[PDB]
């Protein structure tokens, strides 16, 4: 990086050992935990499954289908612009609303 041309480096740093080397022409966004910004909804199908779903319940895939098309429902509610929506679509949405959606399934009468 010409220290003693366009090139971008991204460093996975578990042990946090690299700040001192670069402290001195080139920007130094020294990202951190709180400084970080990241949404839950950008994820793709399978990690959407991972974070919250767990497999112990033996008829869980009932819930998998419920989940997968549920969030689609919530997005088409929050995406009246878009048509023929599906789960994989990473477009804005809210999860508390789907929490209430599934809650009403307990409220069933």
């Amino acid at each position: 990086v010409g220290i003693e041309k366009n090139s971008h480096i991204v460093i996975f740093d578990i042990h946090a050992e690299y700040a001192a080397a670069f402290n001195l022409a080139f920007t130094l966004n020294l990202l951190g935990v709180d400084n970080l910004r990241l949404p839950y909804w950008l994820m793709n199908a399978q990690e959407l499954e991972q974070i919250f779903i767990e497999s112990n319940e033996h008829n869980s895939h009932n819930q998998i289908s419920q989940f997968r098309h549920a969030v689609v429902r919530n997005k088409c509610k929050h995406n009246p612009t878009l048509t023929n929506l599906s789960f994989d679509t990473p477009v804005y949405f809210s999860i508390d609303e789907v929490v209430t959606y599934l809650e009403n399934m307990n409220n069933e009468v």
């Binding site: 578990i14 946090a16 080397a21």
Partner: protein, 209 residues
Amino acid sequence: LADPRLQFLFYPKKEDGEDLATGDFADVVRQFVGYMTKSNVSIIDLSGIPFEVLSIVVSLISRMIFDFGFHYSKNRVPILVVCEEAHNYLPRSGGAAYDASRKSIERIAKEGRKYGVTLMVVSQRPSEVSETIFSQCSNFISLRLTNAVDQTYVKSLLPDLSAGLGDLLPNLAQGEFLIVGDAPLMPTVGHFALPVPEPHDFDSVIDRW
């Protein structure tokens, strides 16, 4: 959701105090890339991130770093991803907990040159790192490797290494290296110069608690 430290995943704020909107998607993307002129460096610090949410973060970042370049070079400045302590999150054989990442990285190792995204791997224990990633590495740099298993394992990968060049590895001194691959005209032994700058009342607490 009540889990405090994970809050940053569910509900983030900007400086103004607003909940994130879709418009700044690109903005957060350019939190990584940044300006095309005056190229910059990014340092993720993974210590604070919990251990159970470590794989997912990295798969997500890999997805973005890959697809941005896809779409930028479709019609036509490379980026490189440096993975330290690789073996923690790319094991040879492991359960689902670390599989989510295995899939993101391997695909690049299959094909990502066209886009300008390229990897770098660092491993103190090269044997316990998985099968697929290494074979797609053009050049190799090796410092001292004392343990016995790794001698044979690394001897296998690069057969340009003579029958005798293996014995050299345990006798390597402080800052001496062996480079083999396409870049060098001839296999050679070398020395590193040092870098500058080098890398490096209970009531009170329960009140916060």
